């Protein structure tokens, strides 16, 4: 399951949506667009924990972020936006304070986003998929989805 959040220039979440049924179960019930960045990330993880989808027994989470580079002004400020974006999720992570849980962050450009749109899949998942192709391992979206993120990382 993957969860996609939309934020504004003010680093404020405006729209929250789940791409998967499991994702909707955890994403649903979250009312706080103003502070969904850190709060939703930590609450969602707990929701998954309660549902049983995620187990504290060694769990890796991959988070991908993308900014609009179409604007020159945005590109320059992009470095500042990226640093703040990482910091906001960092706080959520600090909230969890779970040693067994390790986070990972990556950057996504418009090129990857366009590809994600074509495949109607989350850009974050696309990133992992890209690595799989490089490895040459026969990996598919459904198979990876059925497998845990931690399991995918460790091969």
């Amino acid at each position: 399951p993957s969860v996609e959040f939309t934020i504004n220039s003010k680093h404020k979440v405006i729209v929250t949506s789940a791409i998967n049924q499991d994702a909707s179960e955890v994403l649903d019930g979250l009312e706080l667009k103003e502070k969904d960045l850190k709060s939703a990330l930590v609450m969602v993880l707990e929701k998954a924990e309660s549902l049983g989808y995620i187990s504290d027994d060694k769990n890796y989470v991959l988070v991908s972020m993308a900014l609009n580079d179409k604007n020159k002004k945005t590109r320059d400020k992009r470095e500042e936006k990226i640093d703040e974006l990482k910091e906001t999720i960092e706080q959520g992570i600090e909230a969890l304070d779970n040693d067994t849980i390790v986070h990972r962050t990556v950057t996504v450009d418009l090129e990857e986003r366009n590809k994600a749109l074509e495949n109607e899949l989350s850009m974050g998942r696309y990133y992992l998929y890209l690595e799989a192709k490089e490895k040459g391992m026969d990996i598919t979206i459904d198979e990876v989805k059925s497998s845990k993120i931690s399991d995918l990382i460790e091969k």
Binding site: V3, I14, S64, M65, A66, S122, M123, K145
Partner: peptide, 12 residues
């Protein structure tokens, strides 16, 4: 254009 930026999270 309305959405300035967006982020995605992959978790199983």
């Amino acid at each position: 254009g309305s959405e300035y930026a967006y982020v995605s999270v992959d978790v199983n």
